[PDB]
Design an enzyme around this catalytic site. Sequence first.
Site, short mmCIF file in Angstrom:
data_model
loop_
_atom_site.label_atom_id
_atom_site.label_comp_id
_atom_site.label_asym_id
_atom_site.label_seq_id
_atom_site.Cartn_x
_atom_site.Cartn_y
_atom_site.Cartn_z
N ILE A 14 0.88 -1.39 -0.10
CA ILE A 14 0.23 -0.01 0.20
C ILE A 14 0.86 1.01 -0.10
O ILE A 14 0.46 2.41 -1.02
CB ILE A 14 -0.77 0.00 1.34
N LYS A 16 3.79 3.52 2.38
CA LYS A 16 4.57 3.75 3.73
C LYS A 16 4.94 5.35 4.26
O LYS A 16 5.27 6.37 3.21
CB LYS A 16 6.43 3.55 3.61
N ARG A 18 6.26 7.46 8.43
CA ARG A 18 7.18 7.77 8.55
C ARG A 18 8.51 6.24 9.19
O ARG A 18 9.35 5.98 8.88
CB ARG A 18 7.11 8.89 9.41
N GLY A 20 7.65 2.08 9.29
CA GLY A 20 6.13 0.82 8.78
C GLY A 20 5.77 1.10 7.55
O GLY A 20 5.51 1.71 7.27
N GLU A 21 6.23 -0.29 7.25
CA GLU A 21 5.57 -0.06 5.93
C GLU A 21 4.01 -1.15 5.78
O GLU A 21 4.12 -1.99 6.85
CB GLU A 21 6.45 -0.92 4.87
N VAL A 22 3.02 0.21 5.40
CA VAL A 22 1.82 -0.80 4.89
C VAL A 22 1.58 -1.80 4.11
O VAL A 22 1.50 -1.12 2.15
CB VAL A 22 1.11 0.65 5.09
N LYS A 35 1.11 -3.04 9.36
CA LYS A 35 1.81 -1.96 8.90
C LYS A 35 2.60 -2.65 9.57
O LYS A 35 2.80 -3.18 10.76
CB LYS A 35 2.06 -0.81 10.20
N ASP A 136 1.02 14.80 14.31
CA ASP A 136 1.03 15.03 12.86
C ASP A 136 -0.31 14.64 11.69
O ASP A 136 0.15 14.06 11.23
CB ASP A 136 2.36 13.59 12.58
F1 LIG Z 1 -3.82 3.47 3.17
C1 LIG Z 1 -5.00 2.40 3.77
C2 LIG Z 1 -5.74 1.30 3.73
N1 LIG Z 1 -6.43 1.12 4.28
C3 LIG Z 1 -5.93 1.37 5.96
C4 LIG Z 1 -4.78 1.47 5.98
C5 LIG Z 1 -4.04 2.45 5.64
N2 LIG Z 1 -3.16 3.10 5.53
C6 LIG Z 1 -2.29 3.98 6.66
N3 LIG Z 1 -2.83 2.30 7.03
C7 LIG Z 1 -2.01 2.54 9.01
C8 LIG Z 1 -1.46 1.37 9.87
C9 LIG Z 1 -2.06 0.58 8.79
C10 LIG Z 1 -2.21 -1.07 9.63
C11 LIG Z 1 -1.88 -1.08 11.08
C12 LIG Z 1 -2.14 0.43 11.09
C13 LIG Z 1 -1.91 0.48 13.56
F2 LIG Z 1 -2.49 -0.11 13.92
F3 LIG Z 1 -1.40 1.89 13.61
F4 LIG Z 1 -3.05 1.80 13.65
N4 LIG Z 1 -2.00 1.34 10.97
N5 LIG Z 1 -1.30 3.79 9.17
C14 LIG Z 1 -1.43 4.82 8.74
N6 LIG Z 1 -0.91 6.06 8.10
C15 LIG Z 1 -0.82 6.52 7.31
C16 LIG Z 1 -1.90 6.25 6.27
C17 LIG Z 1 -2.06 4.91 6.96
#
Ligand SMILES: Fc1cnccc1Nc1nc(-c2cccc(C(F)(F)F)n2)nc2[nH]ccc12
Length: 304
Positions: A14, A16, A18, A20-22, A35, A136
């Site tokens: 998906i 990245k 700051r 962790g890679e999503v 992430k 942020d």
């Molecule tokens: F594009 C996306 C589409 N569907 C779901 C999230 C999307 N994107 C993102 N996922 C996560 C994320 C992902 C998993 C777990 C966590 C947790 F556990 F930390 F909440 N975070 N952090 C992000 N920061 C900024 C965007 C963004």
Amino acid sequence: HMTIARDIVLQESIGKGRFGEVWRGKWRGEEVAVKIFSSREERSWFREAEIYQTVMLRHENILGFIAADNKDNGTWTQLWLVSDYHEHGSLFDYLNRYTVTVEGMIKLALSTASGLAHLHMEIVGTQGKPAIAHRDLKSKNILVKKNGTCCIADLGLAVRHDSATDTIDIAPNHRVGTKRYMAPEVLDDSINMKHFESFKRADIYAMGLVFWEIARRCSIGGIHEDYQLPYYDLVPSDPSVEEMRKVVCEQKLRPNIPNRWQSCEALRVMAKIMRECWYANGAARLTALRIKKTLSQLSQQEGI
Ligand SMILES: Fc1cnccc1Nc1nc(-c2cccc(C(F)(F)F)n2)nc2[nH]ccc12
């Protein structure tokens, strides 16, 4: 029965932020977002897991947290955070790809303010909830759901307040967030970081910038502005703190509010909110709760 990393299969990258890679993954036939952090990023992974595990945090406008876990592939250990999956991805991506209706704009702004109001709200009692400031907030840190509403994500830099002792759970570092969205008091370092309300007020300034990004994409009679990040007209890409401070603190500029926004009630309300989020004095800004109220009154009038 509970969701665990061993039962999740990664399918697609998906992006990245700051830390962790999503990835998009599948868990028991359902899509989830994952992430992934390396072992040397344990502090960043743990802090975000800790914020998301806060009592009473869950809210329709806060990214739905599922689990924190580890996954050993036989060579190295990955540290995972798992959440709900939202196909549209970030509000940044959504606004770049689409224009929105007046209803569409109000739905995105109201949901964003409702999530921030919940994050900011302290609940006292047995199963309380500490007040949390984001630090942020930006369009890349807000996601858009299928129903056209937003949910706030990226809570790794958050700070939590304990009212009973007037303490913040961490010793906060200065200027941690995205430089473009830093409030004037963060840019010039005049922020009093011992007062938790200072962090809530700085989040409001950032929300005003996000409202500006959304309003630009509100198409009325086929008329709208192209997508831009706030200050696109004044600073380079990847601006430094000094570049931002010269514009925001010294020259005292803010994103331009176009004349066409005074021709529509919804846009007049949005523009007024922005101006009241952009005051240099954090104490003069609206609260997320007050914004939620104003936008709820507007959505009720529009029949959303
Ligand atoms: F594009 C996306 C589409 N569907 C779901 C999230 C999307 N994107 C993102 N996922 C996560 C994320 C992902 C998993 C777990 C966590 C947790 F556990 F930390 F909440 N975070 N952090 C992000 N920061 C900024 C965007 C963004």
